[PDB]
Amino acid sequence: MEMEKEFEQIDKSGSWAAIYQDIRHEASDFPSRVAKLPKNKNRNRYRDVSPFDHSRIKLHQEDNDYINASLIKMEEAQRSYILTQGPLPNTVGHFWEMVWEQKSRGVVMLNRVMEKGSLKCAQYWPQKEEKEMIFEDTNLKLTLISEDIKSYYTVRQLELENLTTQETREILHFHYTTWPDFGVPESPASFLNFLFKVRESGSLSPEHGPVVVHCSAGIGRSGTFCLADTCLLLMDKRKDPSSVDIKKVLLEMRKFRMGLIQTADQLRFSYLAVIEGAKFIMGD
Numbered sequence: 060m061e062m063e064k065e066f067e068q069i070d071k072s073g074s075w076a077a078i079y080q081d082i083r084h085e086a087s088d089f090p091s092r093v094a095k096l097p098k099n100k101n102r103n104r105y106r107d108v109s110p111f112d113h114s115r116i117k118l119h120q121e122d123n124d125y126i127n128a129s130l131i132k133m134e135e136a137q138r139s140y141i142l143t144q145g146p147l148p149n150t151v152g153h154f155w156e157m158v159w160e161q162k163s164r165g166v167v168m169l170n171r172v173m174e175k176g177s178l179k180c181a182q183y184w185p186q187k188e189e190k191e192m193i194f195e196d197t198n199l200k201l202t203l204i205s206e207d208i209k210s211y212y213t214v215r216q217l218e219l220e221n222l223t224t225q226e227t228r229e230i231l232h233f234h235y236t237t238w239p240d241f242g243v244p245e246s247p248a249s250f251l252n253f254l255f256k257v258r259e260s261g262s263l264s265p266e267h268g269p270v271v272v273h274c275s276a277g278i279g280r281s282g283t284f285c286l287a288d289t290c291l292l293l294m295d296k297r298k299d300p301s302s303v304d305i306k307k308v309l310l311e312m313r314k315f316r317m318g319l320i321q322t323a324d325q326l327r328f329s330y331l332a333v334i335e336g337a338k339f340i341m342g343d
């Protein structure tokens with residue numbers, strides 16, 4: 060079926076939970092043996108969220124190459140994404156090592172450091188220009204260059220220096236700051252505006268490594284971001300945009316990381332975002 064009318068049909072029939080459970084039943088199951096080794100317990104935020112072995116990002120290190128991060132490679136759309144958990148106190152250096160080694164231009168953060176009164180990720184970037192961060196375990200230096208605070212999101216320019224080689228690179232940090240503590244946003248307008256700002260920066264383009272996107276576990280909000288982006292790109296590429304099947308795209312992405320889209324409300328929100336976004340693209 061088309062998307063917008065499939066949407067009204069699920070709303071009128073109140074069957075979002077059944078649609079979402081079908082996706083969960085059909086989703087791929089691949090091994091995640093490296094994630095479960097005892098030496099990696101303090102590298103995982105949640106015991107039930109792990110990268111598959113076949114798609115995990117490897118650190119270029121001979122001691123321990125493990126990070127909780129997955130490469131989502133979308134062949135028809137010609138887009139790749141790295142989805143990862145929010146960094147932990149003992150993985151902030153690994154996080155920036157990955158950014159460097161994978162040649163990423165942008166980092167997309169969809170959570171706040173504290174939500175619901177608890178810590179959801181480490182404070183892994185500097186908050187003042189004159190107070191830079193040094194990660195001694197991976198030999199990197201990170202400096203805040205500038206910060207632009209808007210009503211729904213903040214963009215930061217960061218400098219990452221490989222202290223071994225003295226090479227430097229500019230990284231863009233896109234921080235969506237207004238996702239509610241519970242549920243999903245009422246309108247997708249600010250989330251789509253944010254997605255378009257990431258796109259306009261070059262951070263999603265083939266001349267760079269894959270964008271790094273995270274929330275707390277790296278599957279829920281993060282899954283919503285890449286699902287909406289890929290569906291909208293396919294609608295622009297194909298002769299028949301109404302052939303884009305969001306459920307089929309989601310199952311393809313779940314071949315590369317488990318659990319993408321965590322609730323039926325997140326599924327409904329993803330449909331809403333793609334539907335509204337397709338009107339603004341045109342040719343709109």
Ligand SMILES: O=C(O)c1csc(-c2cccs2)n1
Binds near residue numbers: 148182183184193
């Ligand atoms: O939460 C933490 O532990 C944390 C946040 S930034 C950081 C480091 C910066 C530079 C070296 S360690 N640690």
Ligand SMILES: O=C(O)c1csc(-c2cccs2)n1
Binds near residue numbers: 299
């Ligand atoms: O909508 C089209 O034009 C369409 C439907 S499927 C499709 C392709 C799949 C893989 C490569 S092109 N294009």
Ligand SMILES: O=C(O)c1csc(-c2cccs2)n1
Binds near residue numbers: 061302
């Ligand atoms: O099937 C639809 O309603 C749909 C989704 S995107 C699309 C486009 C039309 C013209 C350009 S893109 N139509």
